[PDB]
């Protein structure tokens, strides 16, 4: 049927990264259904409840900075030169929905 993945491997977190910072990050994409933080550097598992919208935050989000931090997002495991201007518009909007959420986290 639909086994797509909706699990992201979600690494290279700051230790002042909270578990419920990275679930509003990720809910801004799509619904989660589940977000486990845990390895020195902490990394966490995101679920979605659409493979759609696990797929739509793979693409943005890796690569960009949480806290002045590179994160790092993949699948959490392996599945069963257009676009590229639609892939910047994606990374930029990702990084700004980032700068806001810890804004907030502080104010």
Known sequence: ??????????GNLSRDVTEALILQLFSQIGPCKNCK???NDPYCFV???EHRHAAAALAAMNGRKIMG???KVNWATTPSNVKDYYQKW???????????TTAAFQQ
């Open 90 to 100: 994606m990374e930029e909007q990702a990084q700004s929905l980032i700068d806001k």
């Open 69 to 71: 931090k590179e994160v």
């Open 1 to 10: 049927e639909d086994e797509m993945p909706k699990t992201l491997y979600v």
């Open 47 to 49: 679920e979605f409840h």
């Open 37 to 39: 933080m845990i390895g």
